[PDB]
Amino acid sequence: ISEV
Amino acid sequence: ISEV
Amino acid sequence: GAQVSSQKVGAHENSSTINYTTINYYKDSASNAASKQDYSQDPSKFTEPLKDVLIKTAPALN
Amino acid sequence: GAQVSSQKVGAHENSSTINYTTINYYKDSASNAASKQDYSQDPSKFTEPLKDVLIKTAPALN
Amino acid sequence: FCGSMMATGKILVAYAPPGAQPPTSRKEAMLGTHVIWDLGLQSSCTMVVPWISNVTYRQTTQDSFTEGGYISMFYQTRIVVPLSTPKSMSMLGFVSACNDFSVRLLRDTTHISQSA
Amino acid sequence: QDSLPDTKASGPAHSKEVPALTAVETGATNPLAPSDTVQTRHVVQRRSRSESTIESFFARGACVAIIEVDNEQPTTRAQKLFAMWRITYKDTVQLRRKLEFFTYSRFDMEFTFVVTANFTNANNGHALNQVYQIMYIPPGAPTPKSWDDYTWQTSSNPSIFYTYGAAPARISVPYVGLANAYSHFYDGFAKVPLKTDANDQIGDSLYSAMTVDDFGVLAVRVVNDHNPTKVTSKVRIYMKPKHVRVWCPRPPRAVPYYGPGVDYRNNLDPLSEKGLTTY
Amino acid sequence: QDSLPDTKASGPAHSKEVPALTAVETGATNPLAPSDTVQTRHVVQRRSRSESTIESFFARGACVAIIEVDNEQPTTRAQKLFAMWRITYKDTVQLRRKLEFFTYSRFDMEFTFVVTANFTNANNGHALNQVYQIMYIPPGAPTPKSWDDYTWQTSSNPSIFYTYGAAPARISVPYVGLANAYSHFYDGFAKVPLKTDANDQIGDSLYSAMTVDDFGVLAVRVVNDHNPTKVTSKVRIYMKPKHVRVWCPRPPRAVPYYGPGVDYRNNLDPLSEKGLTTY
Amino acid sequence: DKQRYTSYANANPGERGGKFYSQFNKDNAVTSPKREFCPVDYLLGCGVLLGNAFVYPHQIINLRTNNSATIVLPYVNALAIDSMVKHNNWGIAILPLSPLDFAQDSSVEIPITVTIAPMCSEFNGLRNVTAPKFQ
Amino acid sequence: ACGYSDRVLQLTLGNSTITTQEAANSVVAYGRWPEFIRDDEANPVDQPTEPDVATCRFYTLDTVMWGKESKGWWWKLPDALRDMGLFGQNMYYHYLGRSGYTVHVQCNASKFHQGALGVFAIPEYCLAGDSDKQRYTSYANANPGERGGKFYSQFNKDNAVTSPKREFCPVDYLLGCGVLLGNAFVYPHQIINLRTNNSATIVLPYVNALAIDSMVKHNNWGIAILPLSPLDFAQDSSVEIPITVTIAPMCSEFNGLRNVTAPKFQ
Amino acid sequence: ACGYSDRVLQLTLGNSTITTQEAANSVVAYGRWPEFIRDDEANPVDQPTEPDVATCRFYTLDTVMWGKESKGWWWKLPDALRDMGLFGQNMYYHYLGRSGYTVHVQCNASKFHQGALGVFAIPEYCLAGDSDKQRYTSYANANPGERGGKFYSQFNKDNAVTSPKREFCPVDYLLGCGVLLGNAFVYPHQIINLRTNNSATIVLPYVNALAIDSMVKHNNWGIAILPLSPLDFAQDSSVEIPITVTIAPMCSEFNGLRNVTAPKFQ
Ligand SMILES: Cc1cc(CCCCCCCOc2ccc(C3=NCCO3)cc2)on1
Ligand SMILES: Cc1cc(CCCCCCCOc2ccc(C3=NCCO3)cc2)on1
Ligand SMILES: *C(=O)CCCCCCCCCCCCC
Ligand SMILES: *C(=O)CCCCCCCCCCCCC
């Protein structure tokens, strides 16, 4: 995933 | 995830 | 981004801690459902708004 | 491939940082919703297009 | 000030926050937020209207509950010219937002329309 | 863990500590438990105040309005081909009274729309399924004069296109107040009369009213062109506060509401007759 | 963090620095804050420009067109059994004016279709649910002469088959311009008259028009064969720019639009009457 | 019969204050209306029951117990600051929860004096003086 | 560096800003900036009131006209400001008050006009009177408020012994007080010579024989403006230009609060 | 240091130099200096022509007169320069051309004159027309060359349906295009207020939706000069002063060489  |  | 919490189980089936899962789909927090995990507080600001709060076993007036 | 970001929470329930999740389903980026996390810039190219930009406390003309 | 260079003068420009009588005299206007502009080589003067309000956001429409107050202009001294000079001249006014300015709740404008 | 306090085992007393005696003149409520005046056993308490939390008390969709709109042939006398409603929790009494236990509030608002329709006349043929437009018009925006004029283009105003028969329409709204909290009560005016005023109309306002249009209006229309036979519809609006916070408690409304303010007119006799020494 | 600048605590001044004085002849706007001309306190600023971002300003579905199409018995005089619309944001005024705050733009485009229908005549029996075809015809492709001729086979053109009563149809389109950005304004011509030309018609063009067909057309028809009784339908097209970028700001349109270009005809008096020294 | 119609001058008695009434006498003169409040005592002058007014900050002067009451009020509002001329923040209500009586004298009368102090007072938006019309 | 000048000034006090593109530097009287009463010079024991931005800001007085026959104008402080917003109120609700001042005198004309104004800040400006009667000028006449007073070219003795005017008779070359005007330059001052400058700016400290006193009973400073050189323009015998006085109280503090003083000015 | 100033400028391009002792600083439109087409933004594959000093130099246009009834003047670029030396030739021998510009507007008068000119640089300055007929202004009329065009105080509709003039009808307060003139300041601009400055100087980048285009078919920039405040002098009701526009092409490059384009301007 990509957590920003 | 966030387990509370 | 899934959120996982314990349910307060009322009536138990003949089968311990049970959970549920929540995922916000929208950017605006206004769009969100209610978490309903709400903390409580003291009635004191309403039940005892006194400058000198006194202990119940002692005279209210002295 | 899930994307996770913080929401800017306005009105808070009596329950901290809250998130939401986004997943693109289509190959074409045209199909995508708007991210709405948009950066800002200086008005200067419009408010001050001067070759010699001057400090506000000093004379505009000298 | 778009007058001739030989022209002099001092002007008071003012802002009164809402709630009292709108200024009819320089005497009253002096008492609020104000700039005394002296004409000269620096042609222009800027008066900043500071955010002074009760509510956190005012309405874009007219409404006494979210009203902004009054702007007024008066002669501090007077326009003085020499002979062979124009005794009358134009002043131009400009307005813009300081960097603390913001807007919310997008809506359709009354400034454009279309017939059947 | 949200359970209430366990009852403590309490015995006999012969002492100079007197919890039963007090003085309510002070403004305070006596913090007493049964163990302070009677012999008590030990109870392990499992009960909880979960359902009386502010959120749980308001977490229910209340009917705040009934908007009636028709779809029929545009004639030249007054008609309901479109309708407008001023957004308020005050055309209805139930939710209004719940919100009024408090002076100030802050919350996000959920709007759910139940749409119903029927045939008016015995028979001129039938109608195909209708699409309804619900346009929000914030204070300042152009209001429609006609069911299909340019305002309905809704380029900047938010609008719902509801198809009849589909599940009820639902949207959420942020905390949109001009203040830091919504004022359920405003003791004051939007204008002050000044001695220097020309007429004394200039400084006249309604007591307790704030902004003239408060939150704007909802403009409802049927997007379909009219059938031969007439169809009447009603949009019921359900309102739910969510992510709720409240300040300063108030006594509940005890007599019937008489318009938008604290005004009473009649049925000022809320209480029944009961004999002093009658159980 | 997207909040605006905190106000700084500012005191009295007696100095040779004069921020209140300036010269607008330079072309620049004076960068002043309240602390430059008045005594100010310290404010910790929490307000934000989130809603005025270019995306947020245009993030709303605007009505750009109303296409009317009928389903009835094919007779031999002019009929609406199919219809064609030239794709444009200019048959409508609202979105047009918002886009026109800028000279050039680049964005993906979302099309949403609201379809409504009704019975025309008092009664010849009824109709079964209709399926609508919305065919995109890019410049060059064969245009239909008949509601059911070969073009509708749509083998290479994109088409939507909308079932009546279903949720409104929705598609997305890429940035499809021939240039690196869309030109909201074109000061020039598509043809030049040359001295060596035979007629002087040959080099004549419309001022400010670019390509003749710009983005092609949408051809709308009811796929169903006709009922005994006639059904009229309207397709409303909602257009939303997304993933938007814009260049070179322009003054907003102040007088009413008179066709596709910057031309004005009347109501050239936008401003009201107000006395110079009248609040 | 007119809702939200109490005039500014009548809503604001100044130092003089206002009074309560035992019952609702409707101002009937539609031609020249008094535009006054009609505060009924057991309804706390506002449509609710007086018995519940104790959820508000309060004290009781029961004459066998005390001479006086002392309440310290914070600034309470939906805003950090507002127009004092347009809006009142707090209302002081004094009602006889139990009627005055003395020996057997049917016409007893004692004074009530209210002394108030502003606290942490701050002001913004200076300009020319507001002169309200109180007539 | 950058482009700064003695001639171009900005003054900001409270919500008020003054600009001037033609100043002649600025004066701080006796080299002392205004300040508050120190604990070791303090005399009333009660906690003072310091209204700050609400009173220490620029009050503009009524404009006067300078013409070829103008002999001079005078004002007294705090008297000129007794009716100016919250400063006036503070002054009248208290027995004691002290304040410094920024005085800004304004008079622009043109490159072809002529004339020079002597602007003088005088500590304890006692003025001479009407009569054979000594020290007889009445309170109401000694204190004109914002309106100020005037000078005269010569001494006209108020003769009517039966109903005396009890007014000052300020003769110009005697600075209205028995001395010669030429020597008034030992006082804090500036000159508005029209070929040089638009304005005069003098910063006054609180000057007194006491740390604080009664503002209603006693004026600390007198402002005297006299035409050191007469106004003239082209050949027009009846020229007239405005003179505007704008004053700001500074470091204002007040002691002895009670009910308001209402002086009888009739 | 030494003695330098915002008011005194020298511009030198090619064999031409401009001086000005009374400027109001200078503007670079949108904060972008003119530049050549980068390899990664390039679109025509053929080697460009860059004439440099022969075309990127100061061409002075025919002087116009500003009088009390003057409503405003406008020009389009590159059109104003189509007949200017080797720039014109390069423009007409090629299908494609891009260029930036230094625009220098000149208007001096005297310390006793009065008036203010709004000089505006507008990207894609589409103008309104004559008729009931939309988008009907003819090429010859849309392009006046060096001569430029004018504004009008009001909309006179060309009525002759039989033989239409196919001209623009630019109304001044509507910036000739349906918007209000007061808002034209969002465009790159300068003001010539005669008490302040002789001239205006604006540097224009190449602005377009493409890296390069046809200069003959399309104008990139419009120059609009309007009297924001009318000309006036002493009491003479018929005052008249000159306005001279001098323009320089910058970073000019051309693609698509072939036989010369001869437009029909009749
Ligand atoms: C007084 C007071 C009032 C309240 C409730 C305030 C709620 C304010 C909401 C304002 C916006 O309401 C909208 C309702 C519907 C829509 C809508 N948009 C598309 C169709 O429905 C938009 C806004 O609490 N106290
Ligand atoms: C001038 C100008 C114009 C614009 C907007 C341009 C949008 C161009 C879109 C072109 C394609 O439009 C389509 C619309 C609908 C469909 C469609 N396909 C299946 C049915 O609907 C396809 C393409 O911005 N500036
Ligand atoms: C955190 O959320 C990462 C894990 C996501 C698991 C799959 C979620 C499927 C639902 C995604 C909803 C997207 C809505 C815009
Ligand atoms: C990254 O996306 C890996 C995690 C995916 C979690 C399950 C997603 C369920 C939704 C898949 C949608 C596919 C659409 C074509």
Side-chain angles (χ1 to χ4, degrees), chain A residues 1, chain D residues 1-2 23-26:
Chain A
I1 67 164
Chain D
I23 297 175
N24 292 332
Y25 305 123
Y26 305 87

Side-chain angles (χ1 to χ4, degrees), chain I residues 66-71 230-233 235-239:
Chain I
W66 179 17
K68 299 207 190 200
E69 303 299 282
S70 292
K71 307 303 170 176
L231 183 70
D232 215 334
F233 171 63
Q235 264 69 216
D236 309 12
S237 54
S238 67
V239 194

